[PDB]
Structures are given as C-alpha cells and as structure tokens.
Structure 1
Amino acid sequence: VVGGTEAQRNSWPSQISLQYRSGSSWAHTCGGTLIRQNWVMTAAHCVDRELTFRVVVGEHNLNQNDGTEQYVGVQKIVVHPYWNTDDVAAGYDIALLRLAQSVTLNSYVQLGVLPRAGTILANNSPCYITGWGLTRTNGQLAQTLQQAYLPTVDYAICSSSSYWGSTVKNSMVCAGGDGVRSGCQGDSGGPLHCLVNGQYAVHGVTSFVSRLGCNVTRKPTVFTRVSAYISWINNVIASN
C-alpha cells in the first residue's frame, strides 16, 4: 500500500498473509480474506506459481512476533475456471484456498463479511485497502499491516478512456486513483473493505495496478468485484 497508515492490530481481522516457502524461510506474496474458518479468498494470479503456500491469520508485523499469529498450510486451491493468467483484464481473478486446519476465531482472526450478490457501490463510496504490499512503486513490502482510504470509482468513470478504458470490466471494482494512495505489489489478493449501512464488507479482491506505477493518477487500483462471485464462492465451498 502506497500512501497508507499503519492499521490498528484489531481493525481488519479477516486479513491474511499468503506466503510461499523460500529456502528455509517463508516469504509474503499476497493478501487474502478469511471467509470460513478453513477457507481463504484470494486472487487467482497469486497462486499461478507452483509453490508451497501457507496462510497466516492474526498477522500484524511480518518481521516480528505479534503473539497472535496462527500458521496453517494450504490443502487445496480452487481457481475460478475462467481465469487466464495471460489476460488479467478479462477478470475472474479469484481463487479459494481450503486450509489444512480450521483456524480459531478471536479479536485478531474473524471471518470477512461479503456483500450481497449483485451489490454495486455508488461512485466515491468509502473504502480502505489493506495489505503488506510495497509502500512505493518499485519499493519494498511493509513490515506492519497498512491501510489506505480509497474511495470507489464507478464503472462509467473507471472504464473511460483517461482511466482504464476497456481494460476494466463490470466484474471489477475500481478504487482510488488520486496519485498518492494505492495498492501495490504484494497487496494482490487482499481485501477492499467498504462501509455500507454501518458495516464494513469485503467488496474487492485486489487484482492489478498500472504497469507504469502503483499510485498513478486516474489509474485506480482494480479489484475483483466480490459481489459478482457469491454463487461461485458458495458453490465451491459446498462441493469441497
């Protein structure tokens, strides 16, 4: 997250860190949202590589013991069957991860609330992106979980020629684009939390930023629209 602030430890208890095994270590690669005690929602592109993945729930500082983490292996990966890694602009950038164990819920570990199917936010709706991604274009991962205020940019604006044009689809949510605050590499797969009738819900799964940079004016961060995928999500969990 570029232009973020450090999240309070218990603000976003559904955020997870998706990590891969790297030598004798683990490396953060993406975010995710805990949606059942044994299921995480992330971006399909995050699991393109044939790596050993683990999820960390209750994570705050990637580099320090928080005293709240639970570490769990990924047992099964179900990518949207329409995802094409050579075509992120087509959409379908969503995957579900079945965890090897069910995690224990507490003020640091909670299920993310998903929107009702078909919900579309009004332009300029209040949302926060969260994650440990780069804090500058071509920078480094954050140590502590970051949040940035990124209001939505509706489809009609976001798909206009000076924004993303044809690249954005109605199956996506755009947010931000102010040239200061944005998602960045390593935030992919995590949540966009939007405040609706008093409750935050996870409306987005972070998908992409511009090839030119993370915080680029009129290139808002682009997210998979969760409310387009409720039936898919429910079908995968029920059949797995």
Structure 2
Amino acid sequence: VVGGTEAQRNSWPSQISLQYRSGSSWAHTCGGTLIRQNWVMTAAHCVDRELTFRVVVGEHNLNQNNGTEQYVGVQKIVVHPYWNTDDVAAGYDIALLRLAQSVTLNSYVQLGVLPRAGTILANNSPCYITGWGLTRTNGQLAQTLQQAYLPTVDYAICSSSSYWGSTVKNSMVCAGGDGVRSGCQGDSGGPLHCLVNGQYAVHGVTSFVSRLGCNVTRKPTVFTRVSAYISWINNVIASN
C-alpha cells in the first residue's frame, strides 16, 4: 500500500498473509481473505509459481510475534480454469486455497463477507485496500498492516482512454487513481473492503497496477470483481 496508514490490530480480521518457504524462512508474497475456516480467496497470479505456501491468520506485524497468529499449510490450490498468466487484462485473476486445517475464529480471525452475485458499486464508493506490500513504488514491504482509503472508479470512467481504456473489463473493480494511494507489489490477492448496508464486504481481489509504478494518477488499482464469481466460488467449495 502506497499512501496508507497503519491499520488498527483488530480492524480487518479476515485479512491473511500468503507466504512461501524461502530458504529456512517464510517470505510474505500476497494478501488473501479468509472466506471459510478452511478456505482462502486470493489472485491466481500469486500462485503462478510452484512453491511451498502457507497462510497466516490473525497477523499484524510481519516481523514480530503478536500473540495472535495461526500458521496453516496450503493443501489445495484451485485457480480459475480460464486464468491466463500471460494475460492479466483478460481477467480471471482469482484462486481459492483449501487449508490443511480449519483455523479457529476469534476477535482477530473472522470470515470475510462476500457481496451478492452481480453487485456493482456506484462510482466513488467508500472503499479501503489493506495489505503489507510496498509502501512506495520500488520501495519495500510494510512490516505492519497498512490501509488506504480507496474510492471506486466505475467501469465507464475506468475504461475511458485517459484511465485504463480497454485493459479494464467489466469483470474488474477500479479504485483510487489519485497518484498518492494504491496497492503495490505485495498487496495482490488482498481485499478491497467497501461499506454496503453498514457491513464491510470484500468486493475486490487486488490484481494489477501500472507498469509505470504503483500510485499513478488516472491508473487506479485494479481488483478482480468478486460479485462476478460467486457461483464459481460456491461451486468450488461445495465440490471440494
């Protein structure tokens, strides 16, 4: 997150950290959202490489013990059948991870709420991005969970020539674009939480930014539109 502010510890209890076994250590690579006790939602591109992954829930500081973490192995990865690595702008940036164990829910560990299928947010809807990715372009990871106020930009505006043009599809959500705040490398997979009917719901799964840099004016962060997948999400879990 470029332009963010440290989150309060208790604030976004469905946020996970997706990591891979790096040497003797475990390196953070993405965000996710905990959608069942034993399922996490993330971007397929997080899982292009065949690594060893684990999920951390109740996470706040990457580098210290918070007293709240649970660390689960990733037993099974289901990427959208149509996802194509060479073509992020085709969409389908979404994957589900079935966890080796069910995590225990508490004050720090809750399920994230998904939107009803088909829901589309009005322009300039009040959303937040969270995650531990780069705090500048070509910067470095946040140690603590960062949140940025990231108001949506509707399709019509987003696909206009002076924003993304054609590269954005109606299966995506755009948010921010102000040149100050954004997601960055290390935020992919993560939530875009928006306030619908006084619940935060997870509408976005961070996908991509500009090749030019993370916080580029009139290139908002682009997220997989969750409400476009609901029936796919439910079919996976019902079937695995």
Q: TM-score, normalised by structure 2?
A: 1.00
Question: Matches of 1:171 and 1:66 in 2, distance apart?
Answer: 37
Question: Matches of 2:112 and 2:58 in 1, distance apart?
Answer: 13
Question: Matches of 2:107 and 2:91 in 1, distance apart?
Answer: 33
Question: Matches of 1:219 and 1:40 in 2, distance apart?
Answer: 28
Correspondence for 1:91: 91
Question: Matches of 2:175 and 2:168 in 1, distance apart?
Answer: 12
Structure 1 residues 118-150: Cα deviation after superposition (integer angstroms, max 9, x where no partner): 000000000000000000000000000000000
CA drift of 1:92 comes to: 0.2
CA drift of 1:193 comes to: 0.1
CA drift of 1:22 comes to: 0.2
CA drift of 1:197 comes to: 1.1
Question: Matches of 1:220 and 1:113 in 2, distance apart?
Answer: 23
Secondary structure of the corresponding residue to residue 17 of structure 2: strand
Q: RMSD of the TM alignment (CA)?
A: 0.3
Secondary structure of the corresponding residue to residue 207 of structure 2: strand
Question: Matches of 1:48 and 1:109 in 2, distance apart?
Answer: 27
Percent sequence identity over aligned pairs: 100
Correspondence for 1:154: 154
| Structure 2 gaps, min length 5 | none
Correspondence for 1:115: 115
CA drift of 1:220 comes to: 0.2
Question: Matches of 1:162 and 1:107 in 2, distance apart?
Answer: 43
Question: Matches of 1:40 and 1:64 in 2, distance apart?
Answer: 23
Structure 1 residues 151-172: Cα deviation after superposition (integer angstroms, max 9, x where no partner): 0000000000010000000000
Aligned residues: 240
Question: Matches of 2:214 and 2:28 in 1, distance apart?
Answer: 18
CA drift of 1:2 comes to: 0.3
CA drift of 1:184 comes to: 0.3
Q: TM-score, normalised by structure 1?
A: 1.00
Question: Matches of 1:107 and 1:121 in 2, distance apart?
Answer: 29
Structure 1 residues 76-117: Cα deviation after superposition (integer angstroms, max 9, x where no partner): 000000000000000000000000000000011000000000
Structure 1 residues 2-25: Cα deviation after superposition (integer angstroms, max 9, x where no partner): 000000001100000000000000
| Structure 1 gaps, min length 5 | none
Matched, 1:167 2:167: yes
Structure 1 residues 168-219: Cα deviation after superposition (integer angstroms, max 9, x where no partner): 0000000000000000000000000000111100000000000000000000
Question: Matches of 1:83 and 1:140 in 2, distance apart?
Answer: 28
Secondary structure of the corresponding residue to residue 201 of structure 2: strand
Question: Matches of 1:70 and 1:64 in 2, distance apart?
Answer: 14
Matched, 1:143 2:143: yes
Question: Matches of 1:35 and 1:198 in 2, distance apart?
Answer: 19
